[PDB]
Subunit: 346 residues, 5 copies
């Protein structure tokens, strides 16, 4: 029998299908099952506090007016251009900053109608979602991104969103991030929005991401270590080499200050302290203490033999004193941020 | 009774509803009640003097031609696609730089019509609003952002805007800004625009924002303090160490100049002085004075025993003189900017 | 009488109003009166040589076919959606780089038709207009921005543009620019474009803008003064302190070179000299001369008592010689750029 | 015979051509032959890991309902505006980040229909495709870009994509890249996507690109060599010139650290080591070793004649020892990255 | 006679004008005459290798079906909104990267039809055209921009493009570029594109541009000269001032390296050498040679009277030797790049 006729017969003016009316206009709410597939995931920025994702969005619901029985086939595909004659839910993303469709050669849409009236709807989207970040423990941190899917114009009495019982969130094979690691377990929960206009449905996804130490360890931690050792070099120089020792101290202090200033080049202007700030503060304290030690020795040496060995004893003590205290500080610093990071994400 | 018929019966050619005519074509003006809900608020930039906001906008007005009495239901929802057949006010934002709608899956719109003719209209918007800023007292300042809602084509005789008596401006729970604090009280007032073309209605919202000292105190104030103390270190060096003392002074002065230059990296090119400028000027004065003190001592010492103790007395006085004057300056500077900031915002 | 009927009666197929024909198809040209209102004005960039403006554009012309006499009202407002059925002039901006409309809630348009046939048309626009700049006398300069309004498809025989006799250009109250001052007098003149295709009408607006010295005086002039004085400090040091004096000279010269390089960070790569370039060249000459003076003294002192006082006399002369010549240069430099800037803008 | 009639006769309501139905609605799948022509290729960025391409896309398939026999001509061209009445495949690019059409004067489209029903379809596109990169061996690396062409709404039972047997990928004459070399052989293979919704067809293209050493050899490798030689210069200085030798060492170490930091200015924050990182680490080790050598000599020399020649022997050994070890390191480093790069790309 | 009727009479369904058919469907090809007018020209970038232009594009061709004889007027203007009913050629730009129309108040289009059937078509466009650049002889170079105009869907048998015999390319009066000079003579030639789909027509324009030395001479050449002279200053210092001479040499070498690195801030990463690279290499060689000369003198002086005058003779020779060789190098360098630039552009 001719396939062209049934397309308008099912849902035209002859049938009386009005796309502006819910499948059950007076009765129980419409239950919608949601499902996403993460195609691409990246472009995480701390300055603007957002990330970009590319997904396929799947929806399923039942419309009794779309049932058919005269074909022998159980399921049949449709055309993207005829989506304007079918009622569809008004899903939208709450934490969105910007989004757009894809129309590279045709409309990237999929529609499928079953015998009993089940509808499968799949579209391709790209999103710029906002994600607040807690930058305490900055180089060693875990973040939790959020994705919200809620209705806009339909109250809880009409639309109710749900998650598919099995496999709600799927990730494409081989997906990797240059800077983060994406965990394999996801948290699924519920919203409920209350406004002046009423009660609205919402569902939520949580992704856990861990930062990598490979880049930061090369970039920030090692050069400060080299500056500290370079400052320590001055303890073996003759005490009479005043221009040499003073120049070494001043250069080390200024370089440490510039490095500490440059450590916050690509971060938002937050108002609390961080791990990298503590590390740079301790390094500044060490180099400043070395320069003050030389200043004290230089002042002591010119008090005119009992004043000669007094100056030498300070250098002898300092040579074995500074690295030991630095080692103790390193031990405590690295232990406390591996017992504090050990706390559960949830 | 069939729900499909009344949709066109109420407002089609049969009823004679013309969307190009006001609800009361000849008579009292149309009174519109406005209401906003702040979903997101951020991206404040001093260079371009603007900020970005994401809001829901609610409007309410009475249209006598839209009254119905045959349904038993008190209120009934509509479809977003039929908003083209209803008269709507021409609200727009005066201080806008750019704005756009949202159509991520459907049109983010809401429409609701009551029995007596009341209309509720809700849309989702994102805005880039302009906000002039007074950068005097730059690190310790309070700013007042402005949002204006005015008509464009209708004179005061036709449209009059008003605020809802209770709860005009609402803020989403947990909304925070990385750099500012948003006050909980808002100022609501009136406009009245006069042009060559006539008299137009306007309403205004004011938000008060306070800056945070956490970032700036780490970034700018502390390093200058360290540079000043580093310059003070030179007073304990032997007066014969001319290359050491001169190198220390030159390095400190050049570093202070570079820091002062870098303190205005992300600010508009204003033509008045600021608190941070005063602080950097005083620091430059201090380091320059220290270097001039050493120059004076070096010139005095070579005038050939009465000239020997004269040079030593200057160093002895300076060692206890410089920090005391710096402390007095700090006390006055921090007091005056906490009694001047104490002034009321209004 | 019913207001809905006359809307189509005046300008539909019944009346025979064809929007593709001029009001006087064969006869005298159509005279159009123009009027603008500057809502916002800013974003001036020297690198790209353009500025951004937000204006209301008003036009007035007479159409005999739109006359009505049956209403008692003298003037009546219209709807923005019906502008597609009225003939409108094809105005466009010649020096435009980019422009767009505004449709934030509705179309920001205004239409008004009088009894005799007068039409008032008002729209809201944002513009990115190009403005060539003469960067000679860069920190102390006056610029003249241009706005051109010309036709595209209608020859001089059909459309003629004119300015309103009183109040053609109006500025919103309280409008300020962070860097410039906008003069209160505007220049209005005529164009006439000649191409291969014919003769076209044009009108022009000129805005005069003056730069502010507050930012540049802090940013560039004062640090160079401090570097020059820092170089002068070396004349009081002992002549035997070769590492100290040479290090001071080298540091001052390198810092001056870096400052001169950084003085052109945000300017187009023009091929002529400017005031700031002259100032930096003179500062470089001064510091280089100081270092050469020390080199000459150091070479003279080791020619082995008649050679001892010869070296001291050079320092004694230089100490009082350098600041005096610098003061004379400052006097001439500041006088010549306040008698040359005194020239009339026109 | 009139050419206008057949245009609608072939594919209008009279013929009964429904564009929403496949050429063979029930039967074997539609076989589509693909072909591309690379017009422009560039804008490769490592930070965002993507590249931009401009191509012509050709498709060929057979539609039995479009056969004609009454013209004598074998093939006839069409108009771009009538592409809305012909069934076309829903091709799209999987690894796309953004794409758009071209409509500069008309729609850049081509359509051609043969006597037997063959269809040729050509469009112009620009693409921003994502390409993961392995930055190990960073200055000397080969990358493999990927282009995927897959269906969205049609299962494997309906659409099957194939490559043209001869000349699938063509490159415009004279196409060059500033930084890379494009190989003349391309790899063509198959996809097969499996989702929850079914089985979909895909085809793939691989491009091999090689980096050029000309820029990096000037930018990074040579300055580090000069810094190493500059550090070596210190071995010929008198051992008593403590300020000179220490200043030389400190300046060289700080400059090497700054260069190593600046070597990663435009690269993603990866977490593994690279060739340039190894080179900078070795250079830092060399300069640090030179400074430690001077520190050891300075400490040894002041142990008070047997201690005098001991210090001189260290300098004599070091002068001929450092360049030899550096040469051996250079030989091994350059050999291992020309035997490891010798590995086949596939 | 009524002007409204003939507008549809000439080209509607009554006349049978089909816009999808060429003026001569079976016969000689359509000859199109092209003409451009350059309104704005700028935004030349070496990094992305493109430039932006704003032009008017004129086309002329003959359509026999559009002839009229009943008006007395020889030529008559039309409306922009009726361009959808006239056949127009499918011109497009081959080397385009991006383009867009202008619709600031109306569509910026012009149409004019003559008695015999001649059509004049004028539109306003902005273009971002790609231009490969040869950066050899970088500060002193001449570039040749290209503009290509070719068909897309019509074979050589149907459309043939031609240039107007007189005045094909016109430039607006007073057009200037900040960095380049535009020559007054243009090169006009032919294309012929061969693809798999057939033979297509093309025409080409060439613009010759010369760079200006004013900016680069101030920015790069002079500071390197000052650094070289600063290095030469060291030859007059006492040979015993080891810290002073070594510090001067190290500072000069490091500053030269930083300047050479900064000379390529805004250039693509090409793999060949340039004039500025040669200049910086020679400057680095000079400063390194000066430092090696001091190292040799310092090593020679401590070989213990015959060794004393040997060290002094080296300084005496070097003082008159270095500037002479530098002058010879400058003479050859400036001669060879003014006899090589003397080569004809074609
Ligand atoms: C959508 O899901 C809800 C929740 O399961 C359904 O509501 C239930 O419906 C059953 C059958 O009528 C009742 O026995 C329950 O009491 C209902 N529970 C609640 C909380 O309402 C609803 O029927 C579903 N909608 C449709 C159209 O099937
Ligand atoms: C809109 O609000 C205004 C202000 O309240 C109303 O104007 C008043 O109307 C009442 C009732 O007719 C009069 O008694 C007052 O004198 C009016 N005041 C003014 C200042 O005009 C107006 O009627 C309202 N519009 C509608 C449609 O209800
Ligand atoms: C538009 O303005 C022009 C200029 O004033 C008008 O042209 C004049 O018209 C008067 C009345 O017919 C003549 O006496 C003058 O000789 C005309 N001058 C010129 C230079 O043409 C023109 O009539 C106006 N157009 C309309 C429709 O009123
Ligand atoms: C599309 O190509 C496939 C693969 O060649 C065709 O499938 C074959 O068709 C022939 C002829 O009917 C059969 O003998 C083969 O057994 C088929 N092979 C497979 C794997 O199905 C298919 O017929 C082609 N489609 C059309 C419309 O020609
Ligand atoms: C377009 O221009 C071509 C080139 O001049 C014309 O082709 C010539 O036409 C004349 C007149 O019929 C012939 O005598 C020549 O032999 C043709 N030359 C070629 C190379 O074909 C063509 O006729 C023009 N088209 C139209 C419609 O006038």
């Amino acid at each position: 029998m001719s396939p062209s006729d049934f397309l308008d017969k099912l849902m035209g003016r002859t049938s009386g299908y009005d796309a502006r009316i819910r499948p059950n206009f007076k009765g129980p709410p419409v239950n919608v099952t949601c499902n996403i597939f993460i195609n691409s995931f990246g472009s995480i920025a701390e300055t603007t506090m957002d990330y970009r994702v590319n997904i396929f969005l799947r929806q399923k619901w039942n419309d009794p007016r779309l049932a058919y029985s005269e074909y022998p086939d159980d399921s049949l595909d449709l055309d993207p251009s005829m989506l304007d004659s079918i009622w569809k839910p008004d899903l939208f993303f709450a934490n969105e900053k910007g989004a757009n469709f894809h129309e590279v050669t045709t409309d990237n849409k999929l529609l499928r109608i079953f015998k009993n009236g089940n509808v499968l709807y799949s579209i391709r989207l790209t999103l710029t979602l906002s994600c607040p970040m807690d930058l305490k423990n900055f180089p060693m941190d875990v973040q939790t991104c959020i994705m919200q899917l809620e209705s806009f114009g339909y109250t809880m009495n009409d639309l109710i969103f749900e998650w598919q019982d099995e496999a709600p969130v799927q990730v494409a094979e081989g997906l990797t991030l240059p800077q983060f690691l994406l965990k394999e377990e996801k948290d699924l929960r519920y919203c409920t929005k209350h406004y002046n206009t009423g009660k609205f449905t919402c569902i939520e996804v949580r992704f856990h991401l861990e930062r990598q130490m490979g880049y930061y360890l090369i970039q920030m931690y090692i050069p400060s270590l080299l500056i500290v050792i370079l400052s320590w070099v001055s303890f073996w120089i003759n005490m009479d080499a005043a221009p040499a020792r003073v120049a070494l101290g001043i250069t080390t202090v200024l370089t440490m200050t510039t490095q500490s200033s440059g450590s916050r080049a690509s971060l938002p202007k937050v108002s609390y302290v961080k791990a990298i700030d503590i590390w740079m503060a301790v390094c500044l304290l060490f180099v400043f203490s070395a320069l003050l030690e030389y200043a004290a020795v230089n002042f002591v040496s010119r008090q005119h033999k009992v004043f000669i060995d007094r100056a030498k004893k300070i250098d002898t003590i300092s040579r074995a004193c500074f690295p030991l205290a630095f080692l103790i500080f390193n031990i405590f610093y690295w232990v406390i941020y591996k017992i504090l990071r050990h706390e559960d994400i949830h």
